[PDB]
Ligand binder design. Structure first.
Ligand SMILES: CCCCCCCCCCCCCCCCCC(=O)OC[C@H](COP(=O)([O-])OCC(O)COP(=O)([O-])OC[C@@H](COC(=O)CCCCCCCCCCCCCCCCC)OC(=O)CCCCCCCCCCCCCCCCC)OC(=O)CCCCCCCCCCCCCCCCC
Ligand SMILES: CCCCC/C=C/C/C=C/C/C=C\C/C=C\CCCC(=O)O[C@H](COC(=O)CCCCCCCCCCCCCCCCC)COP(=O)(O)O[C@@H]1[C@H](O)[C@H](O)[C@@H](O)[C@H](O)[C@H]1O
Ligand SMILES: CCCCC/C=C/C/C=C/C/C=C\C/C=C\CCCC(=O)O[C@H](COC(=O)CCCCCCCCCCCCCCCCC)COP(=O)(O)O[C@@H]1[C@H](O)[C@H](O)[C@@H](O)[C@H](O)[C@H]1O
Ligand SMILES: CCCCC/C=C\C/C=C\CCCCCCCC(=O)O[C@H](COC(=O)CCCCCCCCCCCCCCC)COP(=O)([O-])OCC[N+](C)(C)C
Ligand SMILES: CCCCCCCCCCCCCCCCCC(=O)OC[C@H](COP(=O)(O)OCCN)OC(=O)CCCCCCCCCCCCCCCCC
Ligand SMILES: CCCCCCCCCCCCCCCCCC(=O)OC[C@H](COP(=O)(O)OCCN)OC(=O)CCCCCCCCCCCCCCCCC
Ligand SMILES: CCCCCCCCCCCCCCCCCC(=O)OC[C@H](COP(=O)(O)OCCN)OC(=O)CCCCCCCCCCCCCCCCC
Lengths: 89, 318, 469, 76, 86, 171, 183, 86, 108
């Protein structure tokens, strides 16, 4: 549970403490979902069931469609502006 | 220990040779397509072409990332060689999820196209690298979807299980349109010129290109056509051999690898043969061909297969 | 019969042109009306609070959920009857309030996402349905792409909803780690004694609650509500609130919760004193959303909150809906129009509205007195029935701070009237064109519910008694 | 030029139109509709006329529902 | 007619893969002691191959056959320990 | 019921069966012989195997400690069948599992020594292969002629033995 | 042979290191390159625990699609970015040194069921005990993991796959809802 | 749902204690669940092995201090290529 | 030590060697885009990702007989209407201004 908690906490503080660009926010958000998976899949193994793996194979998909949606949101934000700012939106 | 290091030695050395003799085979056959001699020869001295220009290619100029993308492109092109079997149960590593691996490495192969456009950047060159990337992923879709509709008849992710299932009839002869569209999706993964707007450290892209050529030839050969299968050959052996011996296992492994290599060699010749005859695509035509016309047919073939397995009993058991 | 609509209309909208969008929305409106009329006999299924678990311990169908399930279609008819229908037939009113091509698709995808939470039993239906509705708010926000504020608002809402979605998924995963099951009834009142669950069940609550505007994290939602256009925001202020609040109220996972009681008090404080010095109307209106969504963590602390909740939710939805429709009427009479997406921005702008017409200010007066709990109105008995449950179950300081919050809030509700009944100097003598008939009949009906719902109060209590007990 | 007649201005003429001018959407939608429509019409004809369905495979060890009559034999 | 210089590369490629696969089958048969490989291995089959290694003594898939077990077969049974998986 | 680890460490225990469980005559047959003799130890020891799995069912959780008596008796009668098939048809049994040690132990590849073994055991040891759960008007698969799935190489000794059994007329 | 023992704690240390190289990088592409490094360290851990199937699904979709997606976005877009300077980011240090301690310890609290608040934490680390693996011969066909996911998504949880269809539907409609500008 | 389905489709490693507890709650009137508690305590210890961990800590605590170490039939570790060597 | 793992250890060594011989032997020393280019990759993901939702069915196709069939058919038939959304809306097609709009010449 160490590797999942560490990816979650450190990815979270990498989300919170940026002021430099917009993409570090996206990729820290994506590694938080990885960090939740790393805890869930080991609880599937140690309890001997698939149902944590059921929630895993569902949240893979929701992380995917999340990225598709949110990067179309960014292209909306970029079309009207000229250049995505350093400080943020 | 010694038992397996000699084994991976023989396989690595054979595949490393065969990818280098393809660079000679393409020059020769395109020479005789256009009535030229082309390269002087092809023998044991014949590697000294591909050796000599592979040496001289390392003498030009280039103008940390630039180090990494040729490297990961070549190692992605080289790790996929374990999972092909060359005979029954002969793999360099045996794994029950070989198609999942093969599929994940067709997914890993796209990154060098991204990271090659960053080096020596311009605005227009960066846009061109974007176009090569997007056609690469666009045909990777239909690649993966037909892998599914092949393993619908197998219902197993093991590869020797596919070919032993294939023993009764090859999958190419019921699903012949699938062979046609895979051959074009196979010259689509690679940049073969019906499909090559976006072309028209370099030694790694050069090697990994032909390695992907012959490796997607392998991926055709085991799942669509017979992998190592030619015929039954039960009757010829009962006349030749008297009992199992190392000569007998040699002769059968020999004929199995011959039946695999003839598939791979005819398909490999057909890549160079479809190179010469046709001009190249507009990129709009490329994306339009991938999505609007071919992929609705792909959904249709995908719906018509389980319904055909449904009409009869005919669900495959793991 | 949502998906029977969605699958059909998505093919129908794919082929229709940009001019056809109004009449598409008119079709979907009438469809939802007849789904409410011809299919509302399913109340008979329950008669003694009978609950069904459908699709195999996955959805949960009871009568609380049937009422929310009916409420959402009703308010969607009122919302879709706005985009279908012209306000006036002028050049301005065509270039204002234009519905996009994919908007009517995203509404019904959001209603699918909102209904699959109130009906939800499993955690995986919870997670998939909060994701479906969170995407739909990401895209209902951003569909007016050629607006600077709307694009900035959608990009903010994205990352904040993303953090709270991973916090919910962490809580779900953690409850799975301490107990093998996902369903909430694996609790069944013997776990909670012998098991430290308080931290998990609050973090599951606080994950949804912070998505709605629980007040340490209230600053981002007010910014999104002020930045979207004035018609996206009536929908995206109503829907996620009522959908997850009826989730968290149906499944009482945080009783006696001290964190919930603190944040309830902090909500009632900072909402009622945040709306005090504010000059923008959607702001004032969104903090009125905040205090009223903070008479909600209160009932969430309770046990057996299904008279107080349901009565107050349909109170609040009618009152909410009516006052947004009042300022959508008020934009014709104002002298200055900025910002095509968001035409009235300041509450200074609707001055002297009684000299323009008097009956729109009569309507505005009954809704603003219904927010502050004036006794012959329907909004009064909502606070009365919250207080008959707060005091019933021991929350006495909560009751005093509830009262003080209501009094501080009325100070900025009445600013709308203080502005709207004053001398203007430029009165209207004759309007050539008149407002659309059905779209003012809807507001007249929503008034007469507010002013005459105490008539049927007693019938509702008897009906309620039969059908939830 | 060949323009759209409409599905509603004559169905069969429209299908004849779409077979010529858009065969990448006719013979793609007509090969995928011939699956779930043939699964509702060609399966009872087979179960009556060609051969009935197969016996199901076992999945675990098949326990009977008896009450252990006492066996005799293989004592020591 | 047919060009021989065009067909000698593909002849070399064909012969390389041929000799490779023949060598591979002989190496696998030499490791297993004269029997072909198991290509698809169940969990059941993996437990069974471990039991065969335990039974025959040391060698891989010797496939011995006996009316009973030896007395050492009762005692050589192993359990697998496994780290905490933190 | 679980697949092994990152780093699993094997161990054994030099110990003894303590006091009250008597000594037993355990099956010392490898995968090929007991896969070959599976239908025959399933045909003779049906009620003992049934009785053991029933006793394991009825003592829920007691389980392992409860029916030591009775997994003693399935081993004895399975050992009895395989001693009888040794002394009965060691040559043709051996032919069948020397076949079945190639071909991944696929049963598909060895029809030819199989039918010979089935004649031998049905004659001397009078046990018969049945696939139960098979309703009538469904042919059992090891009886059909010209199957679709044929092996790669028919092994040599069973070709010879099957041809000589044709010539003798015992088949 | 006990070189082959610490393999899990190794990858834990590598994940710590790899996120330190996520949030401290010059280019915006260097961060996603260490991110695909993080996905493959994760997939090594997932193979290591006993899940060979997932690791390759993580390679297929996480250094598969969404990688290529992010690399693609960072190519064809300009994004200003500053460096991790001390004059703009040392002010965050005394909050980080509190939140590290509190969030890690509290994230290791809820795996326990006592009510002492020090015996809760000390059950997270007090686990050096080797689980014993027995062989049960009850399973007859190789229903591996992916078969059981395909049995549970399709029978027991068919509605989650069928709502999932609507989510992927929305992931197709949304970018066409935005990025088209019809007429 | 997927209540007690295992990795291989069977039952969990703690399905029996859970099914015992659900027998307990099926026959028990609400607010009479205090008699139902020991089945629950058995189930939570099946999941997390807490009491077993504390007991093995106390056994190892008495074991690790002594200079004699071990006077018992010992547990012999082997390398993986030597399961059935002897 | 099996024969699978020397290969995927030994290949990065082969790449490092072919790279170090290159470092030994060599010589050294924003524009606006179209919406179709961004949309191909953004929209590629929900079509790559239904494929992996389709991957658990294809392994377990025998067990879910007659019932998981219809669930997969309905799943695909819900996906085809979003596909026909994007092909009705001409989403991937990129357009240009080469037409003179073909307006007839009007006089006086
Ligand atoms: C079996 C027999 C063989 C199969 C039948 C063979 C033909 C299949 C239909 C061909 C598709 C129609 C078509 O026009 O071609 C392609 C069509 C193109 O049309 P187009 O001519 O290009 O339009 C251009 C015009 O300018 C645009 O013109 P437009 O603006 O007029 O729009 C054209 C129209 C084009 O679309 C259509 O015309 C197709 C409409 C057919 C809908 C019904 C088909 C299913 C029939 C089921 C039969 C069940 C009984 C089976 C019993 C079997 C027992 C064994 O689109 C719509 O109007 C919207 C679709 C409305 C669908 C309503 C569906 C819901 C009600 C029906 C189901 C009710 C169930 C209730 C149960 C639930 C209770 C809770 O492609 C699509 O758009 C996608 C079709 C999606 C189908 C849904
Ligand atoms: C997003 C990014 C995702 C980030 C993930 C990383 C971390 C995630 C964890 C955080 C998740 C979010 C946190 C949300 C807030 C946590 C909610 C929380 O406090 O529950 C606490 C648990 O009491 C601890 O034992 C709380 C003690 C916790 C240990 C303190 C921390 C140790 C710091 C050492 C310095 C209690 O609630 P509660 O009011 O119902 O509890 C009351 C109250 O305890 C009793 O007196 C009442 O009688 C009873 O009715 C009960 O209801
Ligand atoms: C939903 C309705 C309610 C929302 C709030 C709920 C209240 C609880 C239930 C209420 C029950 C509602 C029943 C429907 C009432 C039916 C009804 O009175 O005739 C309508 C209102 O028609 C809706 O406006 C129809 C209302 C909206 C439905 C839109 C589609 C029809 C009265 O317009 P109206 O005569 O002034 O309209 C006149 C008149 O038609 C002609 O002089 C002219 O052609 C026209 O320009 C206009 O001047
Ligand atoms: C001919 C139609 C023409 C087109 C009209 C379209 C839409 C009309 C929509 C709404 C009109 C108001 C109907 C209210 C029904 C409440 C049912 C109910 O009190 O719910 C109770 C429980 O409520 C509660 O807990 C508390 C809710 C508190 C409501 C607070 C505001 C009420 C004051 C005004 C509302 C009554 C005004 C009557 C006007 C004549 C459950 O009982 P139930 O679920 O079996 O009732 C539905 C049976 N049904 C479907 C056949 C009608
Ligand atoms: C990059 C790391 C991502 C790991 C990918 C996993 C590749 C894989 O599929 O391994 C499968 C293989 C065995 O899998 P299986 O199908 O069960 O084999 C059946 C045997 N008859 O597994 C193997 O045979 C060997 C596994 C190779 C993977 C090496 C990863 C080691 C990570 C060490 C961490 C060091 C830092
Ligand atoms: C059974 C019922 C149904 C009956 C119908 C049968 C359906 C099953 C068959 C499915 C197989 C489909 C094969 C792929 C379809 C190709 C589509 C096509 O060729 O035309 C469409 C496309 C242009 O689109 P469009 O705008 O409509 O152009 C009109 C010009 N006529 O054209 C293009 O853009 C490009 C055209 C060339 C494509 C690339 C060529 C690759 C060259 C490889 C050729 C094969 C080489 C074989 C080598 C070995 C031969 C021994
Ligand atoms: C045998 C009888 C049944 C055959 C019916 C065939 C109908 C043919 C559909 C058709 O006409 O397609 C062409 C038309 C194109 O529209 P157009 O006017 O050219 O302008 C927009 C172009 N983008 O319409 C279109 O826009 C194309 C929209 C349909 C695309 C279908 C491809 C998706 C894959 C379908 C899989 C099969 C689904 C079948 C349904 C299964 C459940 C019953």
């Amino acid at each position: 549970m160490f590797i999942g908690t560490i990816i979650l906490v450190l990815s979270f503080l990498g989300f919170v403490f940026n002021r430099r660009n917009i993409i570090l926010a996206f990729i820290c958000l994506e590694t938080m979902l990885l960090g939740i998976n790393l805890i869930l899949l080991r609880n599937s193994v140690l309890f001997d069931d698939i149902s944590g793996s059921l929630f895993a194979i569902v949240i893979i998909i929701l992380a995917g469609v999340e990225s598709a949606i949110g990067l179309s949101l960014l292209v909306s934000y970029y079309r009207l502006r000229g250049v995505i700012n350093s400080y943020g939106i | 220990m010694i038992i397996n290091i000699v084994e991976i030695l023989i396989f690595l050395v054979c595949v490393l040779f065969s990818v280098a003799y393809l660079t000679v085979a393409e020059r020769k056959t395109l020479a005789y397509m256009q009535r030229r001699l082309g390269p002087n020869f092809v023998g044991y001295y014949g590697l000294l072409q591909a050796f000599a220009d592979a040496v001289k290619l390392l003498l030009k100029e280039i103008v940390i990332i630039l180090v990494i993308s040729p490297l990961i492109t070549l190692i992605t092109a080289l790790i996929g060689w374990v999972v092909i079997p060359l005979g029954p149960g002969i793999t360099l590593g045996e794994l029950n999820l070989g198609i999942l691996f093969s599929l994940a490495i067709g997914s890993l192969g796209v990154f060098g196209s991204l990271l090659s456009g960053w080096s020596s950047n311009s605005k227009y060159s960066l846009l061109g690298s974007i176009r090569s990337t997007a056609q690469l992923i666009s045909y990777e879709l239909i690649l993966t979807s037909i892998f599914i509709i092949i393993i619908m008849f197998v219902s197993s992710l093991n590869i020797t299980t596919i070919i032993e299932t294939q023993r009764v009839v090859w999958y190419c002869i019921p699903l012949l349109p699938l062979l046609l569209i895979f051959f074009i999706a196979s010259v689509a993964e690679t940049a073969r010129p019906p499909f090559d707007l976006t072309e028209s450290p370099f030694v790694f892209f050069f090697l990994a290109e032909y390695s992907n050529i012959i490796l997607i030839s392998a991926f055709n050969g085991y799942l669509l056509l017979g992998g190592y299968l030619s015929f039954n050959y039960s009757y010829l052996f009962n006349i030749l051999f008297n009992d199992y011996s190392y000569v007998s296992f040699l002769f059968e492994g020999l004929i199995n690898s011959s039946a695999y290599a003839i598939k791979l060699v005819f398909l490999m010749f057909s890549f160079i043969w479809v190179r010469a005859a046709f001009p190249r695509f507009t990129y709009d035509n490329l994306i339009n061909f991938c999505w609007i016309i071919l992929l609705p047919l792909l959904f249709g073939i995908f719906l018509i297969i389980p319904s055909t397995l449904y009409i009869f009993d005919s669900f495959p058991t793991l | 019969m949502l998906i029977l609509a969605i699958i059909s209309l998505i093919t129908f909208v794919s082929m229709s042109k940009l001019s056809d969008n109004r009449a598409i929305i008119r079709l979907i409106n009438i469809y939802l009306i007849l789904v409410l009329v011809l299919d509302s006999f399913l109340y008979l299924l329950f008669l003694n609070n009978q609950t069904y678990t459908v699709m195999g311990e996955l959805l949960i169908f009871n009568s609380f959920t049937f009422y929310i399930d009916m409420l959402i279609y009703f308010i969607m008819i009122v919302i879709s009857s706005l985009y279908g229908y012209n306000l006036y037939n002028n050049n301005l009113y065509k270039t204002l309030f234009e519905p996009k091509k994919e908007l009517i698709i995203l509404f019904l995808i959001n209603i699918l996402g909102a209904l699959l939470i109130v009906h939800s039993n499993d955690f995986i239906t919870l997670f998939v349905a909060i994701e479906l509705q969170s995407y739909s708010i990401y895209l209902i926000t951003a569909i007016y792409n050629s607006s600077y504020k709307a694009s900035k608002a959608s990009m903010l809402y994205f990352f904040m909803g993303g953090i709270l979605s991973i916090l919910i998924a962490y809580s779900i995963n953690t409850y799975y780690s301490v107990l093998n099951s996902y369903t909430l009834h694996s609790l069944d009142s013997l776990i909670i004694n012998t098991l430290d669950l308080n931290l998990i069940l609050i973090a599951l609550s606080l994950g949804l609650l912070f998505k709605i505007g629980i007040a340490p994290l209230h600053k981002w939602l007010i910014s999104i509500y002020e930045n979207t256009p004035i018609l996206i925001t009536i929908y995206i202020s109503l829907i996620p609130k009522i959908s997850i609040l009826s989730y968290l109220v149906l499944s009482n996972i945080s009783i006696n919760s001290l964190v919930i009681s603190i944040l309830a008090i902090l909500t009632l404080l900072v909402g009622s004193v945040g709306g005090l010095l504010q000059i923008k109307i959607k702001r004032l209106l969104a903090f009125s959303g905040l205090t009223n969504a903070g008479y909600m963590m209160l009932l969430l602390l309770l046990n057996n909150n299904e008279f107080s909740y349901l009565y107050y939710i349909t109170q609040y939805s009618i009152s909410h809906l009516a006052i947004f429709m009042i300022i959508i009427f008020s934009i014709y009479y104002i002298n200055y129009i900025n910002n095509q997406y968001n035409p009235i921005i300041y509450v200074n702008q609707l001055k002297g509205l009684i000299h323009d017409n008097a009956y729109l200010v009569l309507s505005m007066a009954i809704v603003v007195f219904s927010f502050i709990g004036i006794p012959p109105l329907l909004g009064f008995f909502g606070k009365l029935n919250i207080l008959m449950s707060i005091l019933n179950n021991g929350y006495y300081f909560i009751s005093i701070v509830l009262i003080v919050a209501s009094l501080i809030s009325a100070l900025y509700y009445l600013y709308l009237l203080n502005v709207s009944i004053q001398d203007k100097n430029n009165i209207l003598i004759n309007s050539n064109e008149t407002v659309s008939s059905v779209l003012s009949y809807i507001l007249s009906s929503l008034i007469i519910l507010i002013t005459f719902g105490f008539i049927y109060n007693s019938l509702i209590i008897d009906i309620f008694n039969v059908y939830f007990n | 030029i060949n323009a759209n007649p409409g599905f509603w201005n004559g169905p069969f003429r429209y299908l004849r139109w779409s077979a010529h001018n858009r065969p990448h959407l006719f013979f793609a939608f007509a090969i995928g509709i011939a699956g779930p429509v043939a699964a509702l019409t060609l399966t009872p004809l087979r179960r009556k006329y060609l051969y009935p369905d197969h016996s199901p495979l076992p999945q675990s060890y098949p326990l009977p529902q008896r009450a252990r009559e006492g066996l005799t034999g293989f004592d020591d | 007619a047919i060009p021989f210089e065009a067909l000698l590369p593909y002849g070399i490629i064909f012969g390389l893969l041929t000799a490779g696969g023949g060598a591979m089958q002989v190496l696998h048969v030499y490791r297993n002691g004269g029997v072909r490989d198991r290509f698809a291995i169940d969990q059941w089959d993996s437990q069974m191959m471990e039991r065969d290694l335990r039974l025959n003594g040391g060698q891989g898939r010797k496939q011995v056959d006996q009316a009973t077990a030896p007395e050492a077969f009762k005692h050589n049974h192993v359990w697998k320990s496994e780290r905490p998986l933190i | 019921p679980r697949e092994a680890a990152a780093h699993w460490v094997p161990f054994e225990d030099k110990a003894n069966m303590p006091d009250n469980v008597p000594d037993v005559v355990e099956v010392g047959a490898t995968s090929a012989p007991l896969l070959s003799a599976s239908y025959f130890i399933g045909a003779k020891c049906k009620p003992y195997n049934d009785d053991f799995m029933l006793c394991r069912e009825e003592s829920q959780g007691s389980g392992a400690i409860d029916c030591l008596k009775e997994g003693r008796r399935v081993t004895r009668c399975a050992v009895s069948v395989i001693e009888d098939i040794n002394k009965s048809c060691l040559d043709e049994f051996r032919l069948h599992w020397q076949c079945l040690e190639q071909n991944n132990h696929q049963l598909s590849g060895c029809r030819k020594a199989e039918a010979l073994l089935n004649k031998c055991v049905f004659t001397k040891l009078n046990l018969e292969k049945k696939i139960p759960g098979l309703r009538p008007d469904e042919e059992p698969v090891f009886l059909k002629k010209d199957p679709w799935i044929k092996p790669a190489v028919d092994d040599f000794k069973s070709v010879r033995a099957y041809a000589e059994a044709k010539k003798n007329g015992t088949l | 042979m006990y070189l082959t023992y610490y393999f899990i704690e190794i990858t834990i240390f590598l994940a710590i290191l790899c996120t330190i190289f996520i949030i401290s990088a010059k280019n915006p592409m260097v961060s996603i390159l260490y991110m695909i490094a993080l996905f493959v360290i994760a997939a090594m851990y997932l193979y290591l625990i006993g899940l060979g199937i997932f690791s390759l699904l993580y390679i297929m979709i996480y250094i598969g699609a969404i990688a290529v997606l992010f690399l693609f976005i960072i190519t064809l877009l300009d994004i200003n970015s500053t460096e991790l300077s001390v004059k703009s980011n040392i002010r965050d240090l005394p909050l980080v040194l509190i939140s590290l301690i509190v969030l890690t310890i509290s994230g290791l609290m809820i795996y326990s069921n006592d009510s002492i608040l020090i015996n809760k934490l000390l059950e997270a680390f007090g686990n050096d005990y080797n689980t014993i693996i027995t062989q049960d011969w009850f399973n007859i066909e190789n229903t591996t993991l992916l078969t059981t996911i395909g049995n549970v998504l399709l029978t027991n949880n068919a509605f989650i796959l069928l709502v999932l269809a609507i989510v992927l539907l929305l992931g197709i409609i949304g970018p066409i809802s935005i990025t088209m500008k019809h007429k | 749902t997927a209540a007690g389905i295992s990795l291989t489709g069977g039952r969990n490693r703690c399905f029996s204690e859970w099914q015992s507890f659900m027998h307990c709650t099926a026959k028990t009137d609400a607010k009479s669940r205090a008699q139902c508690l020991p089945n629950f305590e058995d189930y939570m210890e099946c999941l997390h092995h807490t009491k077993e961990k504390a007991r093995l800590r106390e056994i190892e605590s008495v074991l690790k201090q002594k200079k004699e170490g071990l006077e018992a039939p010992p547990v012999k570790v082997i390398p993986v290529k030597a399961i059935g060597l002897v | 030590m099996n024969t699978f793992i020397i290969f995927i250890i030994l290949i990065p060594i082969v790449g490092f060697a072919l790279l170090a011989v290159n470092i030994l032997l060599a010589v050294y020393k924003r524009l606006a885009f179209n919406a179709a280019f961004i949309l191909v990759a953004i929209l590629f993901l929900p079509f790559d990702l239904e494929i992996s939702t389709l991957l658990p069915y294809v392994m377990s196709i025998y067990l879910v007989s007659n019932y998981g069939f219809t669930i997969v058919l309905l799943f695909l038939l819900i996906l085809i209407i979003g596909f026909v959304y994007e092909i009705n809306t001409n989403a991937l097609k990129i357009n240009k201004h080469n037409k003179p709009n073909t307006d007839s010449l009007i006089y006086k």
